[PDB]
Amino acid sequence: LVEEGFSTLEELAYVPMKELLEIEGLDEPTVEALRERAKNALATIAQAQEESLGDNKPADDLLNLEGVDRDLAFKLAARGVCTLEDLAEQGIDDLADIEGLTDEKAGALIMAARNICWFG
């Protein structure tokens, strides 16, 4: 694949099927499987980074609790609190070290998360 000029997962995911079928030893089923794997790899990479910080996964799930700014969602996700369920399971004591989160604001966010997850 690298000798045929492919350097990125994006090229393999999006390049016209004809160019991948010009490679010696690739059949239409193997090219389709390679593209599906490349798209799934691209999807997984994006989701992983979005859950690690606050790009999309924690910027929607962890940030569901009213009051969560994007910065706080990334601070929560850096502690492994990636979802609104993960936040509903926390104590105030587990979040007390997050810069900009007061015990009252932590308690309000955990209660908002519990109201949505357990009482919605």
Binding site: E89, Q90, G91, D94, A106, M111, R114
Partner: protein
């Protein structure tokens, strides 16, 4: 401070307290039940 104070609180009130998770609420219920007590008396 007392078991009599705890028994008067409802489950919904205890879930509003700071640093009070679903796991700690289940522990409190299981322990009160072992003594024949229930929350909200």
């Amino acid at each position: 401070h007392y078991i009599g104070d705890l028994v008067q609180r409802t489950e919904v009130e205890l879930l509003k307290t700071p640093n009070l998770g679903k796991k700690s609420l289940t522990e409190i219920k299981d322990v009160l039940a072992s003594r024949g007590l229930s929350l909200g008396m």
